[PDB]
Design a protein around this ligand. Structure first.
Ligand SMILES: [Mg+2]
Ligand SMILES: [Mg+2]
Ligand SMILES: [Mg+2]
Ligand SMILES: [Mg+2]
Ligand SMILES: [Mg+2]
Ligand SMILES: [Mg+2]
Ligand SMILES: [Mg+2]
Ligand SMILES: [Mg+2]
Ligand SMILES: [Mg+2]
Ligand SMILES: [Mg+2]
Ligand SMILES: [Mg+2]
Ligand SMILES: [Mg+2]
Ligand SMILES: [Mg+2]
Ligand SMILES: [Mg+2]
Ligand SMILES: [Mg+2]
Ligand SMILES: [Mg+2]
Ligand SMILES: [Mg+2]
Ligand SMILES: [Mg+2]
Ligand SMILES: [Mg+2]
Ligand SMILES: [Mg+2]
Ligand SMILES: [Mg+2]
Ligand SMILES: [Mg+2]
Ligand SMILES: [Mg+2]
Ligand SMILES: [Mg+2]
Ligand SMILES: [Mg+2]
Ligand SMILES: [Mg+2]
Ligand SMILES: [Mg+2]
Ligand SMILES: [Mg+2]
Ligand SMILES: [Mg+2]
Ligand SMILES: [Mg+2]
Ligand SMILES: [Mg+2]
Lengths: 206, 262, 152
RNA sequence: CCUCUGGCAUGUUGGAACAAUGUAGGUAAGGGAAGUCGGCAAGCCGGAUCCGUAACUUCGGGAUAAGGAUUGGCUCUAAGGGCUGGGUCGGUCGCGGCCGGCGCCUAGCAGCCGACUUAGAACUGGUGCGGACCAGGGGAAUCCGACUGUUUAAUUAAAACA
RNA sequence: UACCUGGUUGAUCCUGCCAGUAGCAUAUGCUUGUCUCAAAGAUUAAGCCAUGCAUGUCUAAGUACGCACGGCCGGUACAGUGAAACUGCGAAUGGCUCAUUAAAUCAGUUAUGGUUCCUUUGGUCGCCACUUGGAUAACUGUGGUAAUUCUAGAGCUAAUACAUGCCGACGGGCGCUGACCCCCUUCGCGGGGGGGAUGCGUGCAUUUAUCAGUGGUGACUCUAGAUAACCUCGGGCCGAUCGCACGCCCCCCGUGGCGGCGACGACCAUUCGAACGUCUGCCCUAUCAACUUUCGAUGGUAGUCGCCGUGCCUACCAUGGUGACCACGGGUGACGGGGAAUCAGGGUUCGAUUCCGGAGAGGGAGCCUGAGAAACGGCUACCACAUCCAAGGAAGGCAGCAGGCGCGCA
RNA sequence: AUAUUAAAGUUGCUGCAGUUAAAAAGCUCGUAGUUGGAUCUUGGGAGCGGGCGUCCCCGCCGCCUCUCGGCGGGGCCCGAAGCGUUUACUUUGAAAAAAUUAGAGUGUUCAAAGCAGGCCCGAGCCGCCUGGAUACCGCAGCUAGGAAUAAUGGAAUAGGACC
RNA sequence: AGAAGACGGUCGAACUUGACUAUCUAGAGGAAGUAAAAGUCGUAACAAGGUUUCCGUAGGUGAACCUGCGGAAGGAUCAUU
């Protein structure tokens, strides 16, 4: 078939090898998943020794972990932004390991408003007036206020992230192998890496 | 080899099975099991070659399949069930009970034992574990995943397992001044107290063992297997005591038995 | 810049370069809390690894690569491959009929972590076998010597 | 080949027909030089990029040898350049200067400009794409004269002369 | 036994060969009373194959309403044989042959801390459940085709086949959340201590991220644990399962509990392995001296695929990699080895051939199932041979065992 | 008949030739290759054992370490470590499929084979006594001893130790 | 739940068409070699072989050969005052 195996290529010295037998079902490959953005479409695959490889062909959501604040809500994978293997895979919106995607900030927003009791994503007075006041409004006092006072300079979120939230899309690096596992579970770009990819993205745009 | 192998040529069979050239092209091939194929006494051989209890392959079958044979306390109707080292085979309708403990050649001597003694066995620990929720394990030499050991056993200690209940009932630690049988290579079925162990990091650990009768040797830890604290062991031993006469000494002892004794 | 000379971001794995909200500037003095390990067999992890800032997944100190099985020496012969060196192991092969030997030289392509600086050529270099990590390369360099002849 | 500037009235006439013969163009089923003194005539080939290139040889050539593939439209990607900018802190003098001290991008980074090419990729069309124009048919051998050159204005361009 | 004789000369001593001498296989000639063993289509043609046989299988314990037998008993399904057919497993072993294949296979050596593993053994296995849904095979009955181990339509009918799916379980236990409530102190904000309804989770496995460093090793990014979530969604998983033999006892009468096997599964260890890797080793050849490389050559970075580790493949970079220590190319009357023949000591030649390992089923290629094949006594194509056809179509592979043809000294 | 080995020291490592029998480049340089002079701890010392002393034999003078572990101060010397400067070399050990070979035992009637056999016993024993050895297994890889031979190092525009 | 089907991808037999390479062969004519043999021409060589032979290199000749130049002793002089 479409075989992974050294037998078919030249030696370190450079001379030709010879085929001492025919191909072997294990000296095997398969055609690539190259899973896209879209509403879920997965295929399972019988592999060696029984077992199953759950090949994503389309995908939409993913379980991305904001590391620094520790929340890891499920979210949309809105779009692919950058992929340092090959540009065309950005253009296609093909999802791979170490793809830089975008994800909606909304569950991280919801979480941060919950946790630190602060607004995230600046606005005039539309989100702040009805919902955040209701999230606040301390009928207990004493205990909960002391807690969220203890959530101190500690809230002080990164600048680059804060901008992304107020826009609404977070750059997130995929850690899973979508074609193999099926999922697209990754993590949010933060600080040094984020700054690096943002620059690489700026350079790409020209 | 398109998959696995389901046969075993005679001649290609293990040497210590005593299997002769003309009889058949094949040997049984022990079933998959606790012991390694090339470390076994396939129940059939143990009977119709070494107890003469059956004549044929068919006769062993018929002995086995009245549920007469009882390999480390259970019952097994496979004729090719690999019995091996420190096991039992209780045969019941006779009250024989054996053990399979190596000879100083290295052949598993048909070693009769008492019905008390035939309760416990002995086992080498292969690997201590820690599985889920912190619950530790052992694994014996003969594939008994024990769970919850005395937090002290670690690898190469030997244990006295019950059998019928299962579970560990006290043990021996691998150290100098402990009786060591070897279960592999040149010095198979020799026994002496230890003396000295030598850790080679990455390579494997050479171990010296001094026989009762002044003689000494070495081995690689794997084959080694302790059987008690110092001179006194924790089991029966076949006559010979795992002591390894020189070929000259053996010939003399054979010569002295002849003519005089009768 | 400097370290990130590549298209994707290079980081050591196994550390999370982020958790921070306290006084005394942004991050610590060492800044990135470096990952490293010791390789064993009494091979001393170098200062250039632990003090050093570089990254390399195939470095047997500062990355995913166990050392296992055969350990040898060679002598550094070509340094041109990036992160790697060819080394010449030489030996005396016995013919029996003629009760003599012959020289024979196998030359192994070998991974050379950037922890090692000042590796001239002609430099005897211990290598420890590992899992393969290139078509041809399995052996990482573990300790280096140089002193056979020219200078410290 | 088509166009503007400028220039003309189709080259000493017009009209109506659309026969044969012609002159100048084209096209032809099946065969493919059977035609003929003789492939004469016409046809094939043709650009570019990428491969690939024999005998022979004066070693320079032969050579665009031969023989192959690709070519459009559309939407993208990558690769190739210039200019200018830090002397920031302190002092003092009139955003600018002068002095002293740091800095000293000495891996450079930042902003502002501007031709044009080359490679790669997607999609797309009734496989069409060097769409007209332009633009080698090759091969094996023999004879002659080395070659480039010259020659009978008006029947001989050659192997003749040089 | 570390053995030499004949032959150049008119004769001599030599170099030197030829010729004899002794083994060992293959053939062949002549010949052959007895007996124990015993090779045998390798060499030529991995040439072609008439016929037949060479892989099937049922226990007490997976589904029996064939009506094919019979029970002993009726009527409470079932009782005992049981072809049939569905179900499961096996068909990857064995057997053959040596075409290929020259650092390849192969041997010793190690690694898998870079993976898969049917089984075997041992661990794990907290409102349809007094047990649910519909489907089909045999059996029945109409057929169609010239012809095949072709099959369609109609009737039914079971399952451990295929599906669906609950009681358990403690409004209770532990994480977060916390309507709130209570005690102390304080001028009071505040500070400290407690308790606490209502919510969400209320994990073995999966995928990702963070934290901490029970048991381990030359050796962790190991095991184990904690937090955050995710479900590789019906085609993640066990979650929670059918069958057989005895037949027992309830502070109690119609119920509720009970031992002994079978079979089944997700995970972990074991075993049988497999697979890739490490080191060192192979015959002739220079009338093979340079080879490899944008069609992967050697490295790097990030992926892709794969059971996993690697140019395995893709992108982007770097310009490496092998060579007189013989690369690279060519040949082999070349499968590797264990081993065999000779032999004083060295050696030389052989090794198709009963063990081990490889490779192949005319040739090439592709795949289905399956734990395991790139299977050939499995398919799908093509090429080469060839077989019936009612000429539309249909079928085929002895390098299994016999046997045939051919080739051939064999 | 032919293949092949010994004969063939007519392929030569052991082990041949090269004045004239076949045979040494016309000559010199010359890189790979191969081959390379001498040189560093020794006599002695002290005992057990053999033929007051002499001549032959046998354990000792692996050093340092105590920076490390222990079989409010310590000893005692073992695990670790400056591992043997870094190899070759040699010896021991460990690992090595079986069959074949070599080779123990054993009257297959003998033998080539085979792996068995043998007894007590009137059988009353209702059996018993034994085998199914060892050797070899290039090279490479692994272990510990030895340190002559041969390489290979270190202190020379200076460096070893020292509350 | 899902059959036939088609877009593209992929592995890729197979056939055509070159191309290079190994083995095998037909060939007028040419030109060698060996062998038979009861030929023909001469006599080069071995004796100072009747011109020492021989080597290298040139040219020539029916043929062996001859001649030129520089070598050789394997010479017909180890020696010449
Ligand atoms: Mg020799
Ligand atoms: Mg006109
Ligand atoms: Mg006009
Ligand atoms: Mg005019
Ligand atoms: Mg025409
Ligand atoms: Mg004509
Ligand atoms: Mg004609
Ligand atoms: Mg013309
Ligand atoms: Mg031409
Ligand atoms: Mg001519
Ligand atoms: Mg001319
Ligand atoms: Mg003219
Ligand atoms: Mg003219
Ligand atoms: Mg004569
Ligand atoms: Mg002869
Ligand atoms: Mg087989
Ligand atoms: Mg395994
Ligand atoms: Mg051949
Ligand atoms: Mg075989
Ligand atoms: Mg055939
Ligand atoms: Mg096969
Ligand atoms: Mg096949
Ligand atoms: Mg067949
Ligand atoms: Mg010979
Ligand atoms: Mg001889
Ligand atoms: Mg000679
Ligand atoms: Mg001569
Ligand atoms: Mg000379
Ligand atoms: Mg010397
Ligand atoms: Mg005559
Ligand atoms: Mg002569």
């Amino acid at each position: 078939g479409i075989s992974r195996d050294n037998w078919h290529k030249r030696r370190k010295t450079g001379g030709k090898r010879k085929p001492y037998h025919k191909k072997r079902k294990y000296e095997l490959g398969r055609p690539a998943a190259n899973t896209k953005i879209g509403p879920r479409r997965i295929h399972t695959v019988r592999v060696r020794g029984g077992n199953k490889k759950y090949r994503a062909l389309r995908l939409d959501v993913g379980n991305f972990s904001w590391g620094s604040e520790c929340c890891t809500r499920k979210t949309r994978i809105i779009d692919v932004v950058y992929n340092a293997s090959n540009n065309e895979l950005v253009r296609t919106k093909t999802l791979v390991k170490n793809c830089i995607v975008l994800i909606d900030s909304t569950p991280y927003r919801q979480w941060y408003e919950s946790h630190y009791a602060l607004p995230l994503g600046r606005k005039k007075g539309a989100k702040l007036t009805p919902e955040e006041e209701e999230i606040l409004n301390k009928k207990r006092s004493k205990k909960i206020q002391k807690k969220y006072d203890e959530r101190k300079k500690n809230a002080k979120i990164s600048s680059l992230l804060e901008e992304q939230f107020q826009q609404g899309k977070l750059l997130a690096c995929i850690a899973s192998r979508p074609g193999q596992c099926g999922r697209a579970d990754g993590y949010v770009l933060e600080g040094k890496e984020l700054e690096f990819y943002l620059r690489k993205i700026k350079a790409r745009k020209g | 080899a398109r998959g696995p192998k389901k046969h075993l040529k005679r001649v290609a069979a293990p040497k210590h099975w005593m299997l002769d050239k003309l009889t058949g092209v094949f040997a049984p091939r022990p079933s998959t099991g606790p012991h390694k194929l090339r470390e076994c006494l396939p129940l059939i051989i143990f009977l119709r070659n070494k107890l003469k209890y059956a004549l044929t392959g068919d006769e062993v079958k018929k002995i086995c399949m009245q549920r007469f044979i009882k390999i480390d306390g259970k019952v097994r109707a496979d004729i090719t069930y690999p019995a091996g080292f420190m096991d039992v085979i209780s045969i019941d309708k006779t009250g024989e009970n054996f053990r399979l403990i190596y000879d100083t050649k290295g052949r598993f001597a048909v070693h009769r034992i008492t019905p008390e003694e035939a309760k416990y066995k002995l086992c080498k620990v292969r690997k201590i574990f820690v599985g889920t929720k912190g619950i530790p394990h052992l694994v014996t030499h003969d594939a008994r995943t024990i769970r919850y050991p005395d937090p002290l056993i670690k690898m190469n200690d030997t244990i006295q397992i019950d059998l019928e209940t299962g579970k560990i009932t006290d043990f021996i630690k691998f150290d100098t001044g402990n009786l060591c049988m070897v279960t592999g290579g040149a010095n198979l079925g020799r026994i002496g107290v230890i003396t000295n162990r030598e850790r080679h990091p990455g390579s494997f650990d050479v171990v010296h063992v001094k026989d009762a009768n002044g003689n000494s040797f070495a081995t690689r830890l794997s084959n080694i297997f302790v059987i008690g604290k110092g001179n006194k062991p924790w089991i029966s031993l076949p006559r010979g005591k795992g002591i390894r006469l020189t070929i000259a000494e053996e010939r003399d002892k054979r010569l002295a038995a002849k003519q005089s004794s009768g | 810049a400097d370290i990130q000379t590549e298209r994707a971001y290079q980081k050591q794995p196994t550390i999370f370069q982020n958790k921070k909200r306290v006084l005394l500037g942004e991050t610590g003095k060492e800044k990135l809390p470096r990952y490293y390990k010791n390789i064993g067999l009494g091979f001393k992890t170098p200062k250039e690894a632990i003090e050093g800032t570089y990254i390399d997944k195939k470095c047997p100190f500062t990355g995913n690569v166990s050392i296992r099985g055969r350990i040898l020496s060679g002598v550094v012969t070509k340094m041109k491959m990036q992160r790697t060196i060819v080394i010449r192991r030489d030996y005396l092969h016995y013919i029996r009929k003629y009760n003599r030997f012959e020289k024979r030289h196998k030359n192994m392509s070998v991974h050379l972590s950037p922890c090692f600086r000042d590796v001239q050529i002609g430099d005897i270099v211990t290598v420890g076998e590992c899992r393969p990590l290139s078509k041809t390369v399995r052996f990482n360099v573990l300790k280096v010597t140089k002193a056979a002849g020219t200078k410290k």
